[PDB]
Design a protein around this ligand. Structure first.
Ligand SMILES: [Ca+2]
Ligand SMILES: [Ca+2]
Ligand SMILES: [Ca+2]
Ligand SMILES: [Ca+2]
Ligand SMILES: [Mn+2]
Ligand SMILES: [Mn+2]
Ligand code: NA
Ligand code: NA
Ligand code: NA
Ligand code: NA
Lengths: 88, 108, 109, 89
């Protein structure tokens, strides 16, 4: 049986695929898919930046999609921001 | 409310914090506490690495960006990203297709 | 006048290009040309995967982010980054320290 | 013997460690180290972004340094930028 920490990491994989499996490439979250992801999965202070601004930031190779490695950038940034805000 | 992703991130944060808050600076881990987190909460994902204390020590030295012998949360979350990556890679190891399918991930 | 990094990137670009100009769109790789690049210029890094035509097909499908059966350079360079990462990982495989040392990388080299 | 392409990828690893092994953590390029890296390894159309701007973009976990995976973001962006400019005359 996996630990609670381990299950969280695997659940993060599952979160990505709820959006990446909608259409096209199975490991591609397109710009409209990222908007859906952000509206659904992220807090207001993360969505505040804007879906288009996040997409530009996450799409490192500018191929028009967010793959899993690029998605982990967003997870890292959310994690740091959330730890920062649970500090106060 | 709170989404699946937010809950997941909270788990990471709360698991780190339970160790970090005990001694010294309340938001950093020292070497023994890092080793404890790894031994307990990553006992499957890092099963083979756990068998060798020097490997675990090298992992900590690697993450310790500012080289102060402590792990901050910012330093620690890179480890979480790497294991999430490794687990997804394992899910697709030797993937031939067609279509999308996940094998078991890390520790499975 | 070119730095070491600039040269390495030039090498990736020119290796891609040598195959992308042959047929179809001059700046994308079709499956045939992708397989050729991998079997030739990645014969060591992807030696295990080169045994399997299916695996190379799946790698391309994964990389083909806009799902048009061809690889742009933008799509392709993710494979380059992954293999560079994997090579460095291999250099540190089972690293116990102390200090910093590299073992041989991918394709042992 | 590795191919020219494979040697290019291992050389990218070598380039990183010329700056990461300057001081501190062996897989950490600090803000001054990055400024050194950008000035020595990249063309002006990359450097014109600003060293401080690049650092903020590459330091994804904001821990004060660029590790190897963060460095590869810069490599990817340089590769895409270079391929783009070589299609412009
Ligand atoms: Ca992308
Ligand atoms: Ca530290
Ligand atoms: Ca494509
Ligand atoms: Ca960093
Ligand atoms: Mn997958
Ligand atoms: Mn190294
Ligand atoms: Na998709
Ligand atoms: Na502490
Ligand atoms: Na072509
Ligand atoms: Na360093």
């Amino acid at each position: 049986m996996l630990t609670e920490l381990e299950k969280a990491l695997n659940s993060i994989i599952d979160v990505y695929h709820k959006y990446s499996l909608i259409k096209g490439n199975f490991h591609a979250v397109y710009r409209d898919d990222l908007k859906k992801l952000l509206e659904t999965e992220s807090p207001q202070y993360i969505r505040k930046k804007g879906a288009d601004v996040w997409f530009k930031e996450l799409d490192i190779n500018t191929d028009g999609a967010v793959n899993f490695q690029e998605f982990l950038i967003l997870v890292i940034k959310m994690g740091v921001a959330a730890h920062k805000k649970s500090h106060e | 409310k709170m989404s699946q992703l937010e809950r997941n991130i909270e788990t990471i944060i709360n698991t780190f914090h339970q160790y970090s808050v005990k001694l010294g600076h309340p938001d950093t881990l020292n070497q023994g506490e890092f080793k404890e987190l790894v031994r307990k909460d990553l006992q499957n994902f890092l099963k083979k690495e756990n068998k060798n204390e020097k490997v675990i020590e090298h992992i900590m030295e690697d993450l310790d960006t500012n080289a102060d012998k402590q792990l901050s949360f910012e330093e620690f979350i890179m480890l979480m990203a790497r294991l999430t990556w490794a687990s997804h890679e394992k899910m697709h190891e030797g993937d031939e297709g067609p279509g999308h399918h996940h094998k078991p991930g890390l520790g499975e």
